[PDB]
């Protein structure tokens, strides 16, 4: 039935002190059948990251679309696109399919290279922009993620702390969702460096 | 399983320092036809309890007989029928609640929303709701149907929490009620300008005001409204 519930999966972003984090599970199943535990849902164009939950085919399609668009954007603008701008591009791109949308739940995370300010935003399937200053959740376990975040979260966490927090939010939420899990990955983003870690979680 | 035919709209109520107030217009609609106009939807049981009913009127009339029967019955072999053993609001409610739920449980509901207002023997204010599904609840203010959406927001501004009851006088309360009735007359397309209002005070008893009317309405600005956008005359 619900297209956004065929493959499953979740994504979640969070802001910390001069840093942003974004994580996702690795499951890609077909209803109850688990099919792949290597389906990362996070992508990036320059220093801007994009996570996408929803129907796998569209997740793939949107990534290929934003790569196309961000590449041309760099060639013409002669600079990499910023988080805020990209958010707009994501929003208009989705609304352009207003009456036959892609079944995805996009999440943007990054640091404005010019202002150094952390940025995260979520969108409904037709572009409605939700720009939160703390966290953004998406996926079949979004309710669980909201519960986790609303409690675990606290402002200006240091990278090392934000990592614990985001990982625990993701992990415990996925464990209550039959369609999420099968491995997770977490990105900790700072002005200078970006670290990627794979979490150890239940495989059921 | 049925479907209402002749119906009454909102029933609003709230409780003040000494008692409770309840009101309801005198209309009995038949779809969009404002068919009947002398319909009393406030049923006094004894004089410490008043039952306000909305919904299907035929079912209302039925619930009315049930109530009068309850009064007659309570009197049987009861030397304290109008003393220690008279009907209490809580009894009348529990009975109605019971009946309401049994009926929905048999898939043949009494298509109504009911509010029981009154004063307990110990002076306590009683105010509780029950509908065709058997659902029940209490609050400093209670309203059925359309009144739940428009009257409550207003009435709650007077008694927002428990500690507000003792600070509210009958004047203030009755005022809120009368104003809510006006507002409902403005936006509910199934409302009437005439209505009844009843007060149940632990000191003054039961005051049942019939034939009220919405007064002091603002309509003058209507003359300055022309067209729906660009029209000038």
């Amino acid at each position: 039935s619900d297209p956004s519930s065929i493959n499953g999966g979740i994504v979640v972003a969070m802001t910390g002190k001069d840093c942003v984090a974004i994580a996702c599970d690795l499951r890609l199943g077909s209803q109850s059948l688990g099919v792949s535990n290597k389906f990362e849902k996070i992508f990036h164009y320059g220093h801007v990251f994009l996570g996408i939950t929803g129907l796998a085919t569209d997740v793939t399609t949107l990534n290929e679309m934003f790569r196309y668009k961000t590449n041309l954007y760099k060639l013409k603008e002669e600079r990499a696109i910023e988080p805020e701008t990209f958010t707009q591009l994501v929003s208009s791109s989705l609304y352009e399919r207003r009456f036959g949308p892609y079944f995805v739940g996009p999440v943007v995370a990054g640091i404005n290279s010019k202002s150094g300010k952390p940025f995260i935003a979520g969108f409904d399937l037709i572009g409605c922009i939700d720009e939160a200053k703390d966290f953004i959740v998406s996926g079949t376990a979004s309710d669980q993620l909201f519960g986790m975040c609303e409690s675990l979260y606290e402002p200006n966490l240091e990278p090392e702390d934000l990592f614990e927090t985001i990982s625990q939010a993701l992990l415990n939420a996925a464990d209550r969702d039959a369609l999420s899990g099968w491995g997770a990955v977490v990105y900790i983003i700072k002005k200078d460096e970006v670290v990627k870690r794979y979490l150890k979680m239940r495989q059921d | 399983t049925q479907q209402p035919i002749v119906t009454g709209t909102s029933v609003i109520s709230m409780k003040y320092d000494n008692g409770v107030i309840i009101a309801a217009d005198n209309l009995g609609s038949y779809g969009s036809l404002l068919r009947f106009n002398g319909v009393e939807r406030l049923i006094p049981v004894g004089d410490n309890t008043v039952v306000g009913i909305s919904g299907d009127i035929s079912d209302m009339q039925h619930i009315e007989r049930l109530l009068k029967d309850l009064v007659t019955e309570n009197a049987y072999d009861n030397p304290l029928a109008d003393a220690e053993e008279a009907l209490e609001p809580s009894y009348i409610f529990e009975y109605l609640a019971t009946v309401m739920y049994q009926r929905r449980s048999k898939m043949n509901p009494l298509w109504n929303a009911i509010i029981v207002a009154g004063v307990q023997s110990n002076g306590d204010q009683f105010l509780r709701y029950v509908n065709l599904l058997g659902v029940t609840y209490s609050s400093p203010t209670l309203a059925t149907g359309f009144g739940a959406h428009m009257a409550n927001p207003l009435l709650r501004k007077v008694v927002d929490r428990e500690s507000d009851i003792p600070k509210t006088t009958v004047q203030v309360a009755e005022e809120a009620i009368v104003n809510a009735m006006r507002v409902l007359y403005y936006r509910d397309a199934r409302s009437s300008r005439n209505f009844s209002l009843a007060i149940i005070d632990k000191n003054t008893g039961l005051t049942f005001k019939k034939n009220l009317q919405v007064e002091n309405m603002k309509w003058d600005f209507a003359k300055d409204i022309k067209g729906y956008g660009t029209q000038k005359i």
Binding site: - | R35, A189, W219, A222, I233
Partner: protein
């Protein structure tokens, strides 16, 4: 909704209630259902607000352009443009419209355009949910060539009964008088017409 148009000795008068609804909620209680499509050609709208407004807005545009090219349009012509729109788009419209206009050679004329898209020229016309309750009343009280005073009364009485029985009708009664003298807007409040 209760709307009517009556032709009398000096011209024609349009009348309407001011209630717009969405279910049992009165979205607007001071609505103006008497719409101007030309100097002395007005209409009464019933049915979909969105549809009747869109239609009226277009007719107004057509008559304005018509005027620029061939001078003043007749009341008949205005009814014709409405009809064309209501008939050709009958499958996507819910508009019951009454067209009333005053002209120096014909006094006042009234054309009723019901749901189907047909046109009917008449001495007077009633429409809207409230109209059903006053068919008898109006048939027994309308007279041709009444005076402005009698007409305003006939309308005030008719619509008060419509507003009385039909829940979709209410608010104030609005009137627009179209005669050689010009255009006059009348407004009557509840307190006045309720006790008639």
């Amino acid at each position: 909704t209760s709307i009517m148009a009556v032709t009398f000795k000096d011209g024609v008068i349009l009348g309407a209630d001011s209630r717009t609804t969405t279910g049992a909620y009165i979205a607007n209680r001071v609505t103006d259902k008497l719409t101007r499509v030309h100097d002395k050609i007005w209409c009464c709208r019933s049915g979909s607000a969105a549809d009747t407004q869109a239609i009226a807005d277009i007719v107004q545009y057509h008559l304005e352009l018509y005027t620029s090219q061939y001078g003043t349009p007749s009341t008949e012509t205005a009814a014709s443009v409405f009809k064309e729109l209501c008939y050709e788009n009958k499958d996507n419209l819910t508009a019951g419209i009454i067209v009333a206009g005053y002209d120096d050679k014909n006094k006042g004329e009234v054309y009723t355009i019901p749901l189907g898209g047909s046109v009917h020229k008449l001495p007077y016309a009633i429409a809207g949910s409230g109209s059903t309750f006053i068919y008898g009343y109006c048939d027994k009280n309308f007279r041709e060539n009444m005076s402005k005073e009698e007409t305003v009364d006939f309308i005030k009485h008719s619509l008060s009964q419509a507003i009385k029985w039909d829940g979709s009708s209410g608010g104030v009664i609005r009137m627009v008088v179209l005669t050689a003298a010009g255009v006059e807007r009348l407004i009557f409040y509840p307190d006045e017409y309720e006790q008639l």
